[PDB]
Design a protein around this nucleic acid. Structure first.
Length: 205
RNA sequence: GUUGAAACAGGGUCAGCUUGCCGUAGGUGGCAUCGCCCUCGUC
């Protein structure tokens, strides 16, 4: 288990419902929490698994309308001209977040030869303490960086001390099981937070 | 290296135009510097 300690000035774990008008999930999504732990280290042998988020700064919001673009980019049309494809996505962002994601991982079917769980474990451990990553972890949106740390047990004060808000059914981790290589056909599994007692435990599927 | 990506607040718009702080009003009226005091005493 790794008690990595994602933190950042802003964060947007955009609720699936309020995607066009981004309203962040009140805490780190276990998908966004996990994909962060793939940004620091991943390989198609490691399969990350968030075991317990722990909120470390209170759920505080700042709305940010960004002139986002409306349409994907495409081989077909060789430019956007944003002023033609403009959209103004509001973003109820999570200001001053922090999350100590108690996450571990497993070995996939394609673990390869060097399937050593300890190898990837210490690889990620060195990456996180050193600060290395494949990708500066995205707090839900890459516009938001995860000023992370690989805590050992506990090195920050979690604010939802007494029993606190149950954020309801949050996106857990989009189901890339039916997908071929590179996540084509997925689905969304979702979870009762369970509550936020003081740091939400997640459910392994 | 399979997992939210890409994304503007843009582009720009004199707060201007202009309008007496004025007209006008005694500082007056009035009040003793007074009352008084050997330059002496003397060589």
């Amino acid at each position: 288990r790794f008690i990595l300690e994602i933190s950042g000035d802003l964060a947007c774990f955009t609720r699936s419902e309020l995607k066009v008008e981004r309203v962040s999930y009140p805490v780190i999504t276990p998908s966004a929490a996990r994909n962060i732990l793939m940004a620091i280290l991943w390989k198609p042998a490691i399969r990350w698994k968030v075991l317990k988020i722990e909120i470390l700064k209170p759920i505080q919001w700042t709305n940010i309308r960004r002139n986002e673009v409306g349409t994907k980019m495409s081989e077909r049309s060789g430019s956007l001209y944003i002023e033609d494809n403009r959209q103004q996505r509001a973003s109820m962002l999570l200001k001053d977040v922090a999350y100590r994601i108690h996450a571990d991982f497993d070995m996939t079917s394609e673990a390869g030869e060097s399937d050593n769980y300890v190898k990837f474990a210490e690889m990620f451990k060195r990456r996180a303490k050193k600060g290395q990553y494949f990708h500066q972890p995205y707090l839900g949106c890459r516009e938001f960086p995860c000023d992370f740390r690989l805590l050992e047990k506990a090195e920050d004060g979690l604010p939802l001390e007494d029993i606190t808000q149950d954020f309801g059914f949050m996106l857990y981790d989009m189901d890339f099981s039916k997908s071929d290589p590179r996540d084509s056909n997925n689905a969304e599994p979702m979870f009762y937070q369970c509550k936020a007692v003081n740091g939400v435990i997640t459910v392994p599927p």
